[PDB]
Design an enzyme around this catalytic site. Structure first.
Site, PDB file in Angstrom:
ATOM      1  N   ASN A 117       7.699   8.094  23.543  1.00 31.23           N
ATOM      2  CA  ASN A 117       6.225   8.977  23.120  1.00 31.23           C
ATOM      3  C   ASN A 117       6.496   9.859  22.148  1.00 31.23           C
ATOM      4  O   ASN A 117       5.609  10.290  21.311  1.00 31.23           O
ATOM      5  CB  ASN A 117       5.969   9.554  24.483  1.00 31.23           C
ATOM      6  CG  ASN A 117       4.225  10.092  24.449  1.00 31.23           C
ATOM      7  OD1 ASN A 117       3.786  10.189  25.418  1.00 31.23           O
ATOM      8  ND2 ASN A 117       3.830  10.126  23.306  1.00 31.23           N
ATOM      9  N   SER A 122       7.536   5.390  27.376  1.00 35.51           N
ATOM     10  CA  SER A 122       7.347   4.677  25.833  1.00 35.51           C
ATOM     11  C   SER A 122       6.111   4.802  25.298  1.00 35.51           C
ATOM     12  O   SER A 122       5.016   5.522  25.630  1.00 35.51           O
ATOM     13  CB  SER A 122       7.736   3.161  26.030  1.00 35.51           C
ATOM     14  OG  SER A 122       8.591   3.007  25.038  1.00 35.51           O
ATOM     15  N   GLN A 123       5.674   3.968  24.152  1.00 38.06           N
ATOM     16  CA  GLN A 123       4.577   3.773  23.597  1.00 38.06           C
ATOM     17  C   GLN A 123       4.179   2.185  23.297  1.00 38.06           C
ATOM     18  O   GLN A 123       5.184   1.464  23.422  1.00 38.06           O
ATOM     19  CB  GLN A 123       4.664   4.515  22.161  1.00 38.06           C
ATOM     20  CG  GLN A 123       4.825   5.939  22.469  1.00 38.06           C
ATOM     21  CD  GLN A 123       3.595   6.754  22.465  1.00 38.06           C
ATOM     22  OE1 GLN A 123       2.935   7.340  21.270  1.00 38.06           O
ATOM     23  NE2 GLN A 123       2.944   6.674  23.439  1.00 38.06           N
ATOM     24  N   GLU A 168       5.063  19.056  31.004  1.00 39.20           N
ATOM     25  CA  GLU A 168       4.817  19.589  29.819  1.00 39.20           C
ATOM     26  C   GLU A 168       3.101  19.640  29.743  1.00 39.20           C
ATOM     27  O   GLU A 168       2.664  20.365  28.671  1.00 39.20           O
ATOM     28  CB  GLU A 168       5.339  18.434  28.856  1.00 39.20           C
ATOM     29  CG  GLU A 168       4.569  17.290  28.786  1.00 39.20           C
ATOM     30  CD  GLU A 168       4.559  16.103  29.670  1.00 39.20           C
ATOM     31  OE1 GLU A 168       5.555  16.453  30.718  1.00 39.20           O
ATOM     32  OE2 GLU A 168       4.163  14.811  29.474  1.00 39.20           O
ATOM     33  N   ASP A 220      -4.647   8.366  25.671  1.00 46.51           N
ATOM     34  CA  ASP A 220      -4.928   9.368  26.626  1.00 46.51           C
ATOM     35  C   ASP A 220      -6.387  10.272  26.335  1.00 46.51           C
ATOM     36  O   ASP A 220      -6.028  11.118  25.680  1.00 46.51           O
ATOM     37  CB  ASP A 220      -3.778  10.086  26.457  1.00 46.51           C
ATOM     38  CG  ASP A 220      -3.292  10.864  27.527  1.00 46.51           C
ATOM     39  OD1 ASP A 220      -3.778  10.859  28.748  1.00 46.51           O
ATOM     40  OD2 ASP A 220      -2.399  11.952  27.398  1.00 46.51           O
ATOM     41  N   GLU A 241      -9.409  14.817  13.820  1.00 44.23           N
ATOM     42  CA  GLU A 241      -8.716  14.091  14.608  1.00 44.23           C
ATOM     43  C   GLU A 241      -9.335  12.751  15.142  1.00 44.23           C
ATOM     44  O   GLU A 241      -8.711  11.749  15.243  1.00 44.23           O
ATOM     45  CB  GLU A 241      -8.201  14.981  15.825  1.00 44.23           C
ATOM     46  CG  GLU A 241      -6.775  14.629  16.497  1.00 44.23           C
TER      47      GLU A 241
END
EC number: 3.2.1.28
Length: 551
Positions: A168, A178-179, A246, A300, A496
């Site tokens: 990630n 992961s991704q 985080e 997300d 974005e």
């Protein structure tokens, strides 16, 4: 000067540079500064290095000494990075080492290390991210910034080898996650560009990237907990303990507060107790499993995944793995005389076995996911054994991947596409499926009415692959118009996220602009330049040209 050209030009030169990063002895401090976590242990910046990388260890120690001002701490990681260990460094977070290239003074022969270069997804960040980096690589290649793209392949190889997966982002607190996987394709497109077979360097890279990809596929995606053994399909089901550190301090407070109150303590105290395994709350352990799974899905977040993600066999993941299997089959046939022996477990496979895995995946996906009526590949829940009906723009990953039959592509184009095609491109899911918005249930960013760069890019290519290039043009036009209008009206800002209903831009958004234009002829470029919206532009064409947009 035409806004489509001002923006093209800006992305291709100035933005990719503003977004480049490269670890040297002088900036390691800057790059490692992390603010996402605030503890005594986080006040100083830190870099974690794998256990079998001493030169690299020497390097970052040297760096710490040349700039004592920074208080740069440098730890070695364990050979066995367990979820428990990862939790154990939540209060002492750090940047992870990445790939390093060797230079040599050509008269003295002194060895030097310098970071292979990479790109970050926005001016705000300093870390190498995961799937964003494949899309950015595509974009970089178009700007003849091949070295930056190759660096990222170099880094993903390193991450799979030393941290067991593509991450990630390259920080201690992402080590369990992961991704979505794109290494095979990322390595193929960088290889075409450096020369192919005629380039010894490129062939070496291709090989290292496919050893890695096979290891990733075997140890991460078709393994452990992420494989559902029933269906044979995979889930985003990372390991990981306790609360992701985080995040915003208050991010989880509303879901946690009831649990704290059921247990007669404050919230601070309840956090601690959970994070030391002293709470026995099953349905809270589950909720964090799904949160981890979301973060690994790259989406997300969205209501498709809220409280389900890690039980879902997604079209997302299983399309990408199809791609892995096909790409690996070719690689073995073409560069391993059709017998590959995995050095780690001495397992010996042939291109035919890989194709057979693909074949099986295709049937498995079609069986559990495909709905001939609506035209969508729906995700399949593997815990309750039942199909989903969330209408996702990721259904196109099946074209991208190459796994859909011609009949399936027809049905998706004719009946699914119209439910996703909005004014400015493909919405991430339909209005129907998102459900009703409220204060109880607020807007999530990867859902209608938002549309995202990666979703456009993958679809464009998928449709081109099945002979629907004419549809790609229409979709591209819609996205490019909307990006160009924004740029003009918002006084130079690239953004974005877009609703299809700063100085750096954003990685895959920028890349989406350049990839989109490749589909656009002069005429289309001029109309986009004049900020003419799709309905008006299409309507102005003679019906022969309107056919270029499938209208």
């Amino acid at each position: 000067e035409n806004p489509v050209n001002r923006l093209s030009r800006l992305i291709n030169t100035q933005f990719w540079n503003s977004l480049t990063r490269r670890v040297d002895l002088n900036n390691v401090g800057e790059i490692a500064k992390d603010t996402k976590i605030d503890t005594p242990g986080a006040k100083n910046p830190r870099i974690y290095v794998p256990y079998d990388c001493p030169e690299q260890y020497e390097f970052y120690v040297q760096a710490s000494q040349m700039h004592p001002s920074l208080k740069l701490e440098v730890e070695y990681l364990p050979k066995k990075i367990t979820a428990e260990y990862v939790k154990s460094v939540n209060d002492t977070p750090g940047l992870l080492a990445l790939a390093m290239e060797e230079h040599f003074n050509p008269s003295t022969g002194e060895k030097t290390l310098i970071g292979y270069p990479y790109a970050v997804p926005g001016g705000r960040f300093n870390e190498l991210y995961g799937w964003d980096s494949y899309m950015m690589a595509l974009g970089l290649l178009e700007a003849n910034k091949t070295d930056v793209a190759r660096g990222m392949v170099e880094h993903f190889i390193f991450e799979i080898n030393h941290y067991g997966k593509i991450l990630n982002a390259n920080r201690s607190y992402y080590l369990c996650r992961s991704q979505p996987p794109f290494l095979t394709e990322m390595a193929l497109v960088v290889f075409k560009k450096l020369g192919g077979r005629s380039n010894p360097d490129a062939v070496d890279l291709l090989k290292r990237a496919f050893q890695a990809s096979i290891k990733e596929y075997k140890t991460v995606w078709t393994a452990s907990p992420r494989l559902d053994p029933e269906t044979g399909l995979s889930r985003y089901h990372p390991n990981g303990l306790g609360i992701p550190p985080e995040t915003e301090s208050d991010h989880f407070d509303t879901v946690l507060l009831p649990y704290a109150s059921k247990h007669g303590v404050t919230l601070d105290e309840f956090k601690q107790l959970y994070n030391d395994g002293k709470i026995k709350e099953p349905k809270l352990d589950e909720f964090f499993l799904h949160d981890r799974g979301v973060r690994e899905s790259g989406h997300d977040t969205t209501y498709r995944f809220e409280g389900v993600c890690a039980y879902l066999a997604t079209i997302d993941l299983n399309s990408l793995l199809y791609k892995y299997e096909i790409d690996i089959a070719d690689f073995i046939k073409e560069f391993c005389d059709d017998k590959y022996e995995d050095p780690l477990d001495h397992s010996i496979t042939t291109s035919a076995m890989w194709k057979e895995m693909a074949k099986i995946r295709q049937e498995k996906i079609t069986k559990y996911m495909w709905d001939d009526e609506s035209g969508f590949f729906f995700d399949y829940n593997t815990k309750i054994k039942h199909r989903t009906s969330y209408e996702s723009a990721t259904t196109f990953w099946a074209l991208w991947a190459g796994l859909a039959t011609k009949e399936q592509a027809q049905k998706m184009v004719e009946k699914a596409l119209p439910k996703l095609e909005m004014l400015g491109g493909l919405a991430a899911c339909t209005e129907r499926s998102r459900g009703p918005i409220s204060i109880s249930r607020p807007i999530r960013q990867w859902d209608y009415p938002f549309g995202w760069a990666p979703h456009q890019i993958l679809a464009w290519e998928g449709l081109r692959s099945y002979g629907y290039l004419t549809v790609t043009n229409r979709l591209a036009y819609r996205w490019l118009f909307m990006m160009t209008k924004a740029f003009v009206d918002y006084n130079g800002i690239v953004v974005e996220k877009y609703d299809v209903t700063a100085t750096e831009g954003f990685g895959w958004v920028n890349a989406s602009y350049i990839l989109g234009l490749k589909y656009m002829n002069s005429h289309a470029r001029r109309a986009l330049g004049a900020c003419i919206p799709p309905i008006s532009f299409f309507s102005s064409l003679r019906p022969q040209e309107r056919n270029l947009y499938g209208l």
